[PDB]
Design a protein around this ligand. Structure first.
Ligand SMILES: Nc1nc2c(ncn2[C@@H]2O[C@H](COP(=O)(O)OP(=O)(O)NP(=O)(O)O)[C@@H](O)[C@H]2O)c(=O)[nH]1
Ligand SMILES: Nc1nc2c(ncn2[C@@H]2O[C@H](COP(=O)(O)OP(=O)(O)NP(=O)(O)O)[C@@H](O)[C@H]2O)c(=O)[nH]1
Ligand SMILES: [Mg+2]
Ligand SMILES: [Mg+2]
Lengths: 46, 166, 51, 165
């Protein structure tokens, strides 16, 4: 129906929110894995 | 004795869930907090006297699109805080629906807390304290007005959850 | 034909959505663990766990 | 002095996560689990007189994730498209990934073609020359690799870094 389409849109909008969110978390984890000391690390977690 | 558990914050967007958590966990308050995307996670260990209590805290994005996901955060939670803006009657009714949902979906044993946040903004209070108190008493909900801005009753409500937790 | 392939496209959507919700939850628990880690050697172990 | 985002694409099970594991950690796993969503690693290697950082996104290649690939390769300076030299279907699938990038990715993207699992030449279902020809006609950087034996893994990556503007 008309609503099934709008339902899909909302669905895919949230889906993309969490894709983006996961991309950020993974980049942050990666920077942590490259971190040399607890200094840099706590800096990244900020 | 170590007792850690899972707690979830629920409520309409922009009522102060994250702020509230930032307060409790990192003791901060950002005036221009940006809307949460999806959800945020933080932990915090607080001792009652003899036993250590670890808070596993899920601060959910409140906007309506994320509604259907909420279970993936509160399922298997032993505590919840439903938050609303005392200067917003619509955010108080929305808060009522979160309570009904938890009562239907979540464990019957879950400790639910109701937060009337932004008490510091009583300059434009749109939700009478006594009406919020009453609503709470009937649903057996730990109610408490709070201010993430001033830290009023922030630590208490968390602390009050831990004690009421079986 | 219309509301057919559209119901499925939704379900696949919801399935992907949940994958990425579980993905983010796992990553956040791990960033927080790391935030709680005492030593730098503790952090390497966390970064090496499972997801 | 130079960091660039690179993305791997290919049909599920062609070797993409293994390729990146090799290049990044020298590892390889006979039983790598299928990727969920996407994984991210970096690698800083000094060209010859300048350090270039690889920001590498390793996408899940299952069909249900297809609509999402754009969200990884938009803004990418480089892509690797991977197929299994023992899987004729995976090669066909790679052709359309290339097509999709030519139409939708940045116009100056460097696209490499990886004939992966070339260590299993004993089951070659994809003629090396049938694939070398396709790559030349599409201006791709074709190169058969093995994540197991590490063959051409550093090369292909280094060829990409080289051809980048
Ligand atoms: N005066 C005051 N302002 C507050 C209080 N709590 C939050 N705010 C303000 O309200 C706004 C939104 O707060 P925020 O914590 O982001 O809300 P939220 O409930 O997490 N929003 P969402 O659900 O969309 O993520 C911020 O600008 C913040 O400063 C409070 O106790 N007092
Ligand atoms: N013989 C051989 N096997 C390989 C090679 N590279 C990967 N494999 C094998 O192929 C299988 C799948 O590898 P994997 O890296 O997970 O594939 P993928 O393309 O990432 N799959 P997905 O897109 O689902 O995440 C594994 O059993 C792995 O060991 C290679 O060069 N030679
Ligand atoms: Mg928030
Ligand atoms: Mg993979």
């Amino acid at each position: 129906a008309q609503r099934l389409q709008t339902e899909l849109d909302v669905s895919e909008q949230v889906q993309r929110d969490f894709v983006k969110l996961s991309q950020t978390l993974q980049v942050q984890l990666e920077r942590i894995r490259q971190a040399d000391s607890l200094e840099r690390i706590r800096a990244i977690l900020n | 004795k170590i007792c850690q558990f899972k707690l979830v914050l629920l409520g309409e967007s922009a009522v102060g869930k994250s702020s509230l958590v930032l307060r409790f966990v990192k003791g901060q308050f950002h005036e221009f907090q940006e809307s949460t995307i999806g959800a945020a996670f933080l932990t915090q260990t607080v001792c009652l006297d003899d036993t250590t209590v670890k808070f596993e805290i899920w601060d959910t994005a409140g906007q309506e699109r994320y509604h259907s996901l909420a279970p993936m955060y509160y399922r298997g939670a032993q505590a919840a805080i439903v938050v609303y803006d005392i200067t917003n009657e619509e955010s108080f009714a929305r808060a009522k629906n979160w309570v009904k949902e938890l009562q239907r979906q979540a464990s019957p044993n879950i400790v639910i807390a109701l937060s009337g946040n932004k008490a510091d903004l009583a300059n434009k209070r749109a939700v009478d304290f006594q009406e919020a108190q009453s609503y709470a008493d009937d649903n057996s909900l730990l109610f408490m007005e709070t201010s993430a801005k001033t830290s009023m009753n922030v630590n208490e409500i968390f602390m009050a959850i831990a004690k009421k937790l079986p």
